């Protein structure tokens, strides 16, 4: 007598001033699930169509967000903008004018934290990604659907947008929603997954009736509600801070990665969203692939208020030239070099207050962060020709240590040398800040962090994980 | 320096309506001058144009209903940063 999706987002231990904007179809605002909690702005920008069907999509979704019996964040205030017509269709221009209306509403009558839900998608748009971005740098939390096309979400908007939470769907057996050639989108542009198949919500047929619907916007709806509750417990959260908590509190490694194309399984995060029960936060960022040149660089970057503590690389080929941490625009950035099929740059983006971080590039018993009180958070390594706690080890290679001055920070280095894939994970309570491979009797093509597990792929190989805690 | 963009999923394109996006530092009265300048020069060529909306608050620019033929003309307008053909979005 509790819908599967609501139980899934309940953590294994568990014990308003936020507003949630919604852009899609019309709404049955006098449906008992959502009645009184959903102000219909009556904003409208919908294309001409080429009655109970008109509001089915949005009624369901406002119900998933705040419905009285089947909503995630009951008691959340919602405002409704109409951007999709009766056939579920809208335009980018309609969605810009809609997002613009939200920001000018917020300037003209400010309120608390704002959570804009974008339960729509079209092809990659420069203009729509710019608008979501500039709205997010204003301090508004945008949550979006990954897309329903069994594809890479980076090819769609606003799913691919910078600084929007992109959510793919999963079903009651913790596997990706797939239906023929349709199904959830995936890839480095998907931030996490949420319940999105067989989701029971308010049905626009009656004021009391319910329907079961499926979609990446249903997954997005759980997360907008999780964020709405998150932002009332701690209204001061920046979007970087929220996304780190969203990742941290998710269920990790439950999805069956075999449902994704082979090349997208590393790029797709194995996270299923969950509410917080009742710290040092790190997330792994994957780069937009560089290219096939021998002089080829890909770049993964952290949020503005997010420090970069490690950097690594992955070549599906093996022929790689490493990675290095460099300052750009005043920010630490991770850059991976190709030999060469092509490479990814895998950054470890952490939230650390009261900490100054710096890169120390030197050869490989030396210590790189010799300044007393500084911690070694991550080791990078790059070379040009193709042939002991605060120390980075190498072979002919130039090392790029990242060292932070941090009072409460405590760091330990676990290693494990052995094959295709070697793993070593930080103990429970520690956060993996840096993941690196130590060479040997086998060529290694990459090392990347998967939550708190360090993963090195080879074809003797040593995985080297740096773990840090607070006190 | 000003570039044009349009959706790759060809059946989602919406030709004839364009989002003119000006540079970051452009003021709303500058954006309206630039948009009426387009209609001014498009009228000289015997084209009718409709400014459907002028943007400000998130990005500077405007939304114009016009022929794609005017895209060379519109790319050379001052302050222009890029132009993008309107396209369809769908409920997910």
């Amino acid at each position: 007598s509790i819908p599967w999706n609501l139980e899934r987002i309940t953590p294994p231990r568990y014990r308003s001033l936020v507003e949630v904007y919604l852009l899609d179809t019309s709404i049955q605002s006098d449906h008992r699930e959502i009645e009184g909690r959903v102000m219909v702005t009556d904003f409208e920008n919908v294309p001409e169509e080429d009655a109970s069907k008109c509001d089915s999509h949005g009624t369901h979704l406002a119900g998933v967000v705040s419905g009285r019996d089947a909503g995630v964040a009951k008691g959340a205030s919602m405002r409704s903008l109409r951007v999709l017509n009766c056939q579920g269709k809208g335009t980018v221009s309609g969605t810009l004018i809609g997002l613009e209306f939200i920001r000018k509403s917020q300037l003209v009558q400010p309120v608390g934290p704002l959570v804009v839900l974008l339960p729509l998608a079209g092809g990659y748009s420069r203009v729509l990604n710019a608008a979501c971005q500039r709205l997010a740098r204003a301090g508004v939390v945008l949550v979006t659907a990954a897309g329903n096309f069994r594809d890479d979400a980076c090819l769609y908007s606003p799913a691919s947008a910078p600084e929007v939470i992109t959510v793919g769907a999963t079903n009651a057996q913790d596997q990706p929603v797939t239906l023929g050639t349709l199904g959830t989108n995936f890839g480095r542009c998907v931030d996490l997954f949420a319940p999105g198949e067989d989701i029971i919500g308010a049905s626009s047929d009656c004021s009391t009736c319910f329907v079961s619907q499926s979609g990446t916007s249903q997954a997005a709806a759980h997360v907008a509600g999780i964020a709405a509750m998150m932002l009332s417990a701690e209204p001061e959260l920046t979007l970087a801070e929220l996304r780190q908590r969203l990742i941290h509190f998710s269920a990790k490694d439950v999805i069956n990665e075999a449902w994704f194309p082979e090349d997208q399984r590393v790029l797709t995060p194995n996270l299923v969203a969950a509410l917080p029960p009742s710290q040092l936060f790190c997330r792994t960022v994957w780069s937009a692939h560089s290219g096939p040149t021998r002089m080829a660089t890909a770049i993964a970057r952290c949020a503005p208020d997010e420090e970069l503590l490690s950097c690594s690389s992955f070549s599906r080929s093996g022929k790689r030239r490493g990675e290095r941490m460099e300052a750009q625009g005043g920010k630490l950035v991770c850059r991976a070099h190709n030999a060469g099929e092509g490479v990814y740059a895998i950054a470890r983006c952490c939230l650390l207050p009261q900490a100054n971080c710096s890169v120390h590039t030197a050869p490989p018993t030396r210590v790189h962060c010799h300044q007393q009180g500084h911690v070694l958070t991550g080791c990078s390594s790059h070379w040009e020709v193709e042939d002991q706690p605060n120390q980075c080890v190498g072979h002919e290679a130039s090392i790029h240590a990242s060292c932070c001055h941090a009072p409460g920070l405590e760091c330990k280095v676990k290693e494990h040398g052995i094959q295709e894939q070697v793993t070593v994970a930080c103990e429970e309570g520690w956060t993996l800040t840096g993941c690196s491979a130590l060479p040997g009797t086998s060529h290694v093509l990459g090392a990347y962090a998967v939550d708190n597990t360090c993963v090195v792929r080879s074809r003797a190989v040593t995985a080297v994980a740096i773990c840090c805690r607070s006190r | 320096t000003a570039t044009f963009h349009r959706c790759a999923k060809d059946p989602w394109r919406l030709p004839g309506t364009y989002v003119v996006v000006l540079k970051e530092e452009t003021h709303l009265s500058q954006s309206e001058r630039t948009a009426r300048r387009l209609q001014a020069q498009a009228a000289r060529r015997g084209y009718l144009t409709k400014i459907l909306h002028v943007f400000h608050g998130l990005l500077p620019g405007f939304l114009v209903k016009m022929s794609g033929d005017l895209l060379e003309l519109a790319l050379k307008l001052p302050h222009v940063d890029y132009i993008e053909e309107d396209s369809s979005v769908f409920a997910q």
Binding site: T25, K53, S56, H57, G88, N148, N171, A172, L179, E197, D198, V211, S212, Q213, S214, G215, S217 | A91, Q92
Partner: peptide
């Protein structure tokens, strides 16, 4: 799954 997004699910 529904057309507004009529096959069944689970």
């Amino acid at each position: 799954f529904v057309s507004t997004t009529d096959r069944p699910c689970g």
